Design a protein around this ligand. Sequence first.
Ligand SMILES: CCCCCCCCCCCCCCCCCC(=O)OC[C@H](COP(=O)([O-])OCC[N+](C)(C)C)OC(=O)CCCCCCCCCCCCCCCCC
Ligand SMILES: CCCCCCCCCCCCCCCCCC(=O)OC[C@H](COP(=O)(O)OCCN)OC(=O)CCCCCCCCCCCCCCCCC
Lengths: 140, 98, 52, 64, 345, 459, 63, 120, 54
Amino acid sequence: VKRFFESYHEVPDGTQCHRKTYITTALGGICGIIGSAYSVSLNPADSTLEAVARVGRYTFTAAAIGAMFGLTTCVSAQVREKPDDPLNYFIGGCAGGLTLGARTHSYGTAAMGCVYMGTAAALFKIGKLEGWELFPTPKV
Amino acid sequence: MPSTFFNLTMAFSLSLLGTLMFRSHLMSTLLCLEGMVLSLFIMTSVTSLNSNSMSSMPIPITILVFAACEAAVGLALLVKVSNTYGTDYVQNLNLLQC
Amino acid sequence: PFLDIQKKLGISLDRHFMFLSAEQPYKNAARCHAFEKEWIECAHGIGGTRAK
Amino acid sequence: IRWTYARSANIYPNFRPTPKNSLLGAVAGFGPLIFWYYVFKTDRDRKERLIQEGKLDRKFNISY
Amino acid sequence: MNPITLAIIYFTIFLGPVITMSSTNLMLMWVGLEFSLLAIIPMLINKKNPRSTEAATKYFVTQATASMIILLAIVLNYKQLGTWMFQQQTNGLILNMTLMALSMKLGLAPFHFWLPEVTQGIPLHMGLILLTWQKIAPLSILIQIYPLLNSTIILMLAITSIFMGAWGGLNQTQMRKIMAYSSIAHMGWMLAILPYNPSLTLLNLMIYIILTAPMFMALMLNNSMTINSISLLWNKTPAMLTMISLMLLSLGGLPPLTGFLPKWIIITELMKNNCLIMATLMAMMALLNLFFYTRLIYSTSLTMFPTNNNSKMMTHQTKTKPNLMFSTLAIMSTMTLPLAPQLIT
Amino acid sequence: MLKIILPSLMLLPLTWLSSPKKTWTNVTSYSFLISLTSLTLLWQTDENYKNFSNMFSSDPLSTPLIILTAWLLPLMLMASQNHLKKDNNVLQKLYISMLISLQILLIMTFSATELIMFYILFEATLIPTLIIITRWGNQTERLNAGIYFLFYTLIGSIPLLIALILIQNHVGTLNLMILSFTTHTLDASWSNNLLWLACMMAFLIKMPLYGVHLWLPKAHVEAPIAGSMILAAILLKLGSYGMIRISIILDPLTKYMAYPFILLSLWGMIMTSSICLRQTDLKSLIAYSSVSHMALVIASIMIQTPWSFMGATMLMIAHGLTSSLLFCLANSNYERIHSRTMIMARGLQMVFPLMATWWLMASLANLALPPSINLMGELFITMSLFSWSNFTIILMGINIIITGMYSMYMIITTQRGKLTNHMINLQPSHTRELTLMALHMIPLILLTTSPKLITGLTM
Amino acid sequence: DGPEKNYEKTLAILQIESEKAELRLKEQEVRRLMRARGDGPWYQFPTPEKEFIDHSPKATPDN
Amino acid sequence: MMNGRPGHEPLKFLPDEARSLPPPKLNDPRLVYMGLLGYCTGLMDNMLRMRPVMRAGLHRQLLFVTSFVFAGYFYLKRQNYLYAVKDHDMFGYIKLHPEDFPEKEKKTYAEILEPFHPVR
Amino acid sequence: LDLIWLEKTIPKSTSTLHTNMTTLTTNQKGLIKLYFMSFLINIILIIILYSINL
Ligand SMILES: CCCCCCCCCCCCCCCCCC(=O)OC[C@H](COP(=O)([O-])OCC[N+](C)(C)C)OC(=O)CCCCCCCCCCCCCCCCC
Ligand SMILES: CCCCCCCCCCCCCCCCCC(=O)OC[C@H](COP(=O)(O)OCCN)OC(=O)CCCCCCCCCCCCCCCCC
């Protein structure tokens, strides 16, 4: 999965949009599996049928988050012809937020997701442009 | 020795996974804890005998004594649970949530 | 260790059986005694990073 | 007292978001801002360009 | 308990972490850990109630699992390197299991689910003993191996520790649970500063201990288990609300209190090591911690909650309960900030 | 600066050791002497800056703020004398101690030569305002107002702390003069943009900027009179001083990062002046007037003209004085009628002629009457804003028109008209509160007479 | 007193602050270099002691 | 980070080379603040035990002030030694590695061209 | 603006978000079985991050 995750970054944005959507969908799926496992273990369902139904619901929701994020980001980058720009990631994160609000069926959650995920995606894009270390090895 | 040590580490891993996945019996949980203890004793003893480390063969004796006193403490706690609730079911132990 | 009471008082409560090439009963050498002695003799006095 | 409470403290408990007031709040909180942004941006870009090729004359302007 | 077993149990509680700190052997640090655990268990089950039994059982099974993982790491290191100390080239898997089990012993998130429940149901002085004394030994083992640990795993554990601690302390009302999630957030701060500067980890640990002690003494003055119970403190002991406010603001990290110094120097060192995003998230969750502290301050000191009728008789009675070193720890935990270069090393 | 800090520090043992029948007198007289001693920082016979020590210094911008704080402290005690007359001696001495702590920490805050010390003293001043508002506030919304104020300000101030530590690591000392001398240009990258926002938003919250100004009206309403004074007259200007100190090391990208905040300030002073027109609470109306005036200060500081910096300085001092006077008149009416309603007390010109006169001069200073320092600040801000862009004059004109409208609406509905004859509990006047209005209004006249003292750093 | 006193006091303050600035930058560089390659007093991670090694002749000759 | 230095005496409070340092002046703001903190501790203890705040326990307040000043003095001596030996190791490492710390030739304001950003 | 939408935008939205998060994160049933299952998930996750970090 390693070469997969840094194979998202081997191509410039606005190019290989289907591939970028597939990798971001896979990342969202893994995050949804982790969150669903935590949900069904901390808060157990009444039976295994609705337990695995909750797992599938969370996984599909987060996979849709990743799919909409990757598709919106790559489409915006290619239609505005400037890949190294955080606003593409802001629009993609906002589209993911509207996707989360549609899955939750709440426009308030849509607005939360849009603003917060767009800000997070913009900061992530800035970090990947200009070298922010999220987990740096000790140096001093 | 590497195959048998791998088998011992997988035995410890299985006992740990059994400890982490609770059932209705705190006795079974304590038995899984001593499955881990026994696996630790065999790995320490085989390592000491393979390395001829006569200075460190007391270490299995110390792990046995210390883990046995720890399990005596745990058995006393399970006795207290069985006395207050009739049984040793771990789902009876849940009123500290609030 | 985190605290050096053993080094301050000069006692050796548990420092004399740290490794295989340490003191042994009736001078029974452990396996790789020479190799571990060579490693410790190399690594002493230069720190962990330079030892690595 | 009832009039002051209704005008001051009852508004947010008794507010519910509807599409009409959402659109009204969006336009009343943003449209003047983008409008004056474009006005001031066009004026400042024109003035800056006029200074860069020197067509704007500041004959006695020293206290800016 | 008679004084013979009281002395034996307290001496072993003292002796466990002392062996762990004084010991240069992984085996001896392990045995000091179960001296601490085994000696403190009768002190939790001292009150003999179902809640105390529940807390003792959960605490025992958590520490037993973590101690067995620690011994697994020690035995694997002993096979791989032939010694009894993670020297320089022990396996990263072994080091990560060691960090896993020490974080489980400490009760920091996502291994934090037992600490508020164990802190609840036991008396306040045992909550103080747990939340202050029982953490020096796992911190000692963590400090002894600082250059070998994994910064990514530590940073994840720390940031989720502060997140869950802030959210829990925001959530509940119970004083012991509030102090437990406060401990989880503070251990998140210490764990985050651990791989870069263990001296600042020790400084944060001492600041947290000298802030936790007068909280627990003030709670033990009236056995105030509840936000309401500490809210009618103005009728019981009005001469303490000022120090309650000052020490809770110090726990929140507000300047010019000396509790701002650990967070400040930790952020400074983390930014010396360039983890700006992590430091920002930690500081925002510290603001959440300060929020539930400020709500507690509002309940107990700045407002005056309604009282009872038997509080008149309780004021009629006298008291000699509050000890002498409450004020010393209180002053050292409030007004020490201009001595910051002396506090840091 | 130590000769001002130490006797203000020794005011606290005087407060806690004075007799209960002499505490107010002793502390008020000695704090007046503190203000008199603090007047010695105006001895600036050279272009050089008064660097008293390695830690404290005085400046042409820092000096008027220090003198203003030292002047407001005895006025604070005078305003707090009345509503604590039925209160315990220990709590009275505690309140006096809280005010003295405000005065001390604000002098150190304005006189600090280090931005990290400035930040420490920044929320070290935040704490006792919280305590004053939360404990001695009257209504039930004081707790919520304290929460709003504290958390707007702290969510502002945390990225300021991160930006300060980053600047210290990048440069080396974070000393103000060392930064001012070895200022380095920025590369206009995203990291520098986010750093600029981090070091700007704390002072923008403390100003408050429009959109994030919601903590101010409720804090000013539910605060006591001393809290309203300290907020409206010192703390907003403290955020002002913070931006002026921090803007030197932010070239060149402030010339385009200034854009959203200038627009927010202009449209927000228009918005808040409209709220002042349609406001039913006197304290809320004065609070929103303060928001509009500090929005003018934002516009000047962000356009960064020297004339704008001067206008911001004179507007700082003038608005602090006139806002404190307005809150004092509102608090006198509130202690008369036990209500905060704008329309409930109407014909006070009849019963209180001298207090209505003080009302009139306070409102005339509020609406920028010439040749006051208020209008000098607004006019020079107007000149600099028109130099920055010629279409700012429309927003300035709308703001000034609505400013005159809300000031005269205040005067008409609080003084003029028929008297509400049902208010038979109208005591004539306290010499204490009349003295309070006089001590607020006379320094406005003196600074109008000599405006060179509050011109600031630029000229 | 006069303007020269404030002028020279400001000069002394600026000298002290500049020296503190360059000292802080140098100690950052020193700590980074020493942590990267520990060869001085600081960041000396421990190492097992040679004094607890048996050097006497033993039962097995091949040691 | 300074525990592994050569010549480190284990668990030694004030080693003999610390005797080379000048002692604190014994009337300096740190120790004066320590005495003030001890006095405040005594007053706070009196108020918490519901005694007269200043008129009671004068021996207790004197003991508090004396112990605070004593402990602060010895801790200040240790901290001064620690900062001095940190600076000593700093300057020794800088002298021992001159190629990593070059004295850069820094120009005046006559060869460097800072860009001008007009405010208008 | 002031009494509806800025309140709905910054402070009440932040408070509602943190209230929802703290309820969701501390709706704990109080079962040591669920807690140890969570601990097992944490162990598996940390092994996964070690394997992908190397
Ligand atoms: C009151 C306002 C609240 C909202 C706005 C908050 C500030 C927004 C702008 C600053 C970013 C966030 C704070 C970072 C502080 C440090 C900035 C800095 O040093 O930048 C340069 C640095 C970059 O450092 P650098 O300059 O060394 O870059 C490296 C450059 N090279 C490689 C060439 C050497 O930027 C960052 O590190 C920013 C990362 C921020 C990530 C975390 C953000 C968390 C969320 C923040 C807001 C939370 C509260 C509000 C939530 C919503 C409420 C409704
Ligand atoms: C134009 C510029 C736009 C950009 C700038 C926007 C930001 C401006 C500054 C932010 C201001 C935030 C203000 C927050 C406080 C106001 C809300 C509040 O008061 O909530 C109260 C409520 C508890 O109320 P309670 O007292 O229990 O009951 C009511 C009466 N008894 O509280 C609750 O229910 C929960 C409150 C939680 C604590 C809130 C304060 C801390 C918030 C921390 C945010 C961290 C953000 C980053 C997180 C990590 C990344 C996702």
